[PDB]
Amino acid sequence: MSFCSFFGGEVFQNHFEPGVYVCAKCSYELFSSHSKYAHSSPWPAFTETIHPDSVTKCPEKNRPEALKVSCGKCGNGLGHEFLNDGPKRGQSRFCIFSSSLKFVPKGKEAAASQGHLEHHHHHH
Numbered sequence: 251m252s253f254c255s256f257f258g259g260e261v262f263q264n265h266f267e268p269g270v271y272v273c274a275k276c277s278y279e280l281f282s283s284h285s286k287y288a289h290s291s292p293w294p295a296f297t298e299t300i301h302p303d304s305v306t307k308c309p310e311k312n313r314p315e316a317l318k319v320s321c322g323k324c325g326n327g328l329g330h331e332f333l334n335d336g337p338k339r340g341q342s343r344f345c346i347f348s349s350s351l352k353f354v355p356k357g358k359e360a361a362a363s364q365g366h367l368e369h370h371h372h373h374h
């Protein structure tokens with residue numbers, strides 16, 4: 251008699267490491283650094299979005315307290331915003347499918363910090 255086993259029940263607690271989001275169709279890297287925060291929990295979501303020209307949304311009929319959002323460029327439509335329901339709270343936040351867009355993490359960690367070096371100037 252011996253037997254060996256060790257587990258917690260789920261892997262989820264380490265899903266907070268830094269990265270970027272890219273299209274499920276277009277593969278182009280797009281998310282604003284301000285539209286999501288850092289936490290380790292069930293129910294991952296983002297408070298805001300980048301609001302570009304290349305994605306679009308439409309309201310529900312049968313669910314008139316929420317709306318669906320699509321990648322109208324490539325013609326997707328799997329994410330949502332539960333809009334006008336929550337306006338004082340952290341109620342009304344966007345939620346999306348894994349088949350709507352992908353995750354590309356950083357190397358190990360780093361990120362979420364400042365550093366600037368840029369110049370071009372001429373006169374003749």
Ligand SMILES: [Zn+2]
Pocket residue numbers: 273274275276321323324325
């Ligand atoms: Zn797309």
